[PDB]
């Protein structure tokens, strides 16, 4: 069976090898290094691929899985908020998906600022938060939506749709059903916003680095990878893209930890099996 224990073992084997090869070394040329001074990485074991880095002062990466273009990042540190907001505005972000739990955000020891559920000022940038709709994803998992309006003197004001799942604890994986529903909501939200920019003739439509959904949890490697994998399988242009391809691409373009837990990988495998999508490359 293409989805049996033999195939699953082989997939794990290949992915394990890749994670080790991608392990970060001292002053690794493959990973973004702190530009001296403030901290760059929220975790010293979760690095940012240099060649695909979005900004020199952020732990965030451009990722393309098959034809699906996104941005994956860590939860921004307090000192990185101004840069985070500027990145969101310049990207003409069609949707920001936050998968960090309200419990993590509320834990002061974790240093995860609640930057999207309240308004505030960050350097020269002012942000307004407004609540919008709420969509149930199943199993009690809720998606709370907001709109973040980013203002800065001399810059165009940009509003960003936010999808926040506050009940998805770290080191865990929600069901394939919930994940599929989440991916559909995130893609739909982005499509509506992207279309608006196209109707206004935005120049971002011609920039491969812009109009990308932005997704993050705490480290930007577990929950974030599970959602990105589900999103690429929701892309009608990715026929024949294998699970091996998906995970190898996320790892090579961010870090070797993408898709951390085995249960998270199982969700991607289950979603693939439902589509008759291959797990391995021949």
């Amino acid at each position: 069976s293409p989805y049996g224990p033999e195939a699953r073992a082989e997939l794990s084997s290949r992915l394990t090898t890749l994670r080790n090869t991608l392990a970060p070394a001292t002053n690794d040329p493959r990973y973004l290094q702190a530009c001296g001074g403030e901290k760059l990485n929220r975790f010293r074991d979760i690095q940012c691929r240099r060649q695909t880095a979005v900004r020199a002062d952020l732990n965030a990466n451009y990722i393309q899985v098959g034809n699906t273009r996104t941005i994956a990042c860590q939860y921004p540190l307090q000192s990185q908020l101004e840069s985070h907001f500027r990145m969101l505005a310049e990207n003409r972000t069609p949707v920001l998906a936050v998968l960090a739990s309200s419990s993590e955000i509320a834990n002061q020891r974790f240093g995860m600022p609640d930057y999207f559920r309240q308004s505030g000022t960050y350097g020269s940038i002012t942000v307004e938060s407004k609540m919008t709709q709420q969509v149930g994803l199943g199993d009690g998992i809720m998606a709370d939506m907001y709109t973040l309006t980013i203002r800065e003197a001399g810059q165009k004001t940009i509003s960003v749709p936010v999808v926040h799942v506050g009940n998805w604890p770290d080191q865990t994986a929600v069901s394939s059903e919930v994940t599929k529903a989440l991916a559909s909501l995130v893609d739909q939200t982005a499509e509506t916003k992207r279309n608006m920019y196209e109707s206004k003739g935005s120049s971002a439509v011609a920039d491969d680095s812009k109009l990308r959904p932005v997704i993050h949890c705490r480290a930007g490697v577990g929950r974030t990878a599970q959602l990105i994998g589900a999103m690429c399988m929701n892309d009608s242009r990715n026929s024949q893209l294998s699970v091996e391809d998906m995970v190898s691409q996320m790892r090579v373009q961010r870090n070797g930890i993408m898709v951390q837990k085995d249960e998270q990988l199982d969700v991607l495998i289950k979603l693939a099996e439902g589509q008759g999508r291959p797990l391995l490359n021949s």
Binding site: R92, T149, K156, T157, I158, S159, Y197, K200, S202
Partner: peptide, 6 residues
Amino acid sequence: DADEYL
């Protein structure tokens, strides 16, 4: 305009 994208 500054807020044309709103």
